[PDB]
Design a protein around this ligand. Structure first.
Ligand code: MPJ
Ligand code: CO
Ligand code: CO
Ligand code: NA
Length: 262
């Protein structure tokens, strides 16, 4: 079931969360035209292991072969880094990192725009981030997860985009993917009331085109069925007495770390 974190658990999650955010801050300058995703993966891994003295939660997970997930353009999620995949001007790329420190996980991701942005790419990234922020603002004890998924969907669809149904946010802590499943759309199947001490991620995947997706032969890579662009952002949070605290906040986030209701 849903694990409630103790204060000591939470302290450890703050550290892991900050470490993960830091990998994202760190990598920025390397994201340029001509770099391969395989190289980005190596830089991230070295940092995690050698500087942070932490470990990547992805390496070996269900056999995943790399340290982070890098998803370019039409890839929705779980893109596998490769020395042969080079970034080009206009690409939009998601880098999703999950670090383990002292047994606790920190999971977060953001989009990067390579070189000169395209109109669609910039728009898509912006809207996706805003959808995540909207959701964060709603988190508080007593509310049903359903309301959050419904809000994300309505926002996104109003902007002419679609939300991916298949992949979702999830509880996180000592475990990588714990209960509950955090859907990014309205579903009558969702019935979970939030309570303080719950820790989970919100990580909406939004497509420029239609919602349909397709899993590749590698068994990890997911792409949009219509080849439209897809974007995603993710944060790990903790439900507090009157709101929430964002554990993976970065310098570039424009939302406050602690959100309070009253
Ligand atoms: C190769 S497993 C990677 C899982 C992602 N961090 P998701 O946001 O749980
Ligand atoms: Co992630
Ligand atoms: Co996640
Ligand atoms: Na993408």
């Amino acid at each position: 079931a849903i694990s409630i974190k103790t204060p000591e658990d939470i302290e450890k999650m703050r550290v892991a969360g900050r470490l993960a955010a830091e990998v994202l801050e760190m990598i920025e300058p390397y994201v340029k035209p001509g770099v391969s995703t395989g190289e980005l993966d190596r830089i991230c891994n070295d940092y995690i292991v050698n500087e942070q003295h932490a470990v990547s939660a992805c390496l070996g997970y269900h056999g995943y072969p790399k340290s982070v997930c890098i998803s370019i353009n039409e890839v929705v999620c779980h893109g596998i880094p490769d020395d042969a995949k080079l970034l080009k001007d206009g690409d939009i790329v998601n880098i999703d990192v999950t670090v383990i420190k002292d047994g606790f996980h920190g999971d977060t991701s953001k989009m990067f725009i390579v070189g000169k942005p395209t109109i669609m790419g910039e728009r898509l990234c912006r809207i996706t981030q805003e959808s995540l922020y909207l959701a964060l603002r709603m988190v508080k004890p007593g509310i049903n997860l359903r309301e959050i998924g419904a809000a994300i969907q309505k926002f996104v669809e109003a902007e002419g985009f679609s939300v991916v149904r298949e992949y979702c946010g999830h509880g996180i802590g000592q475990g990588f993917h714990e209960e509950p499943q955090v859907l990014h759309y309205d579903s009558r199947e969702t019935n979970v009331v939030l309570k303080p001490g719950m820790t989970f991620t919100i990580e909406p995947m939004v497509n420029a085109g239609k919602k349909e997706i397709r899993t590749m032969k590698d068994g990890w890579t997911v792409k949009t069925k219509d080849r439209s662009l897809s974007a995603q952002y993710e944060h790990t949070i903790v439900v507090t007495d009157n709101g929430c605290e964002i554990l993976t906040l970065r310098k570039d986030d424009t939302i406050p770390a602690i959100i309070s209701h009253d």
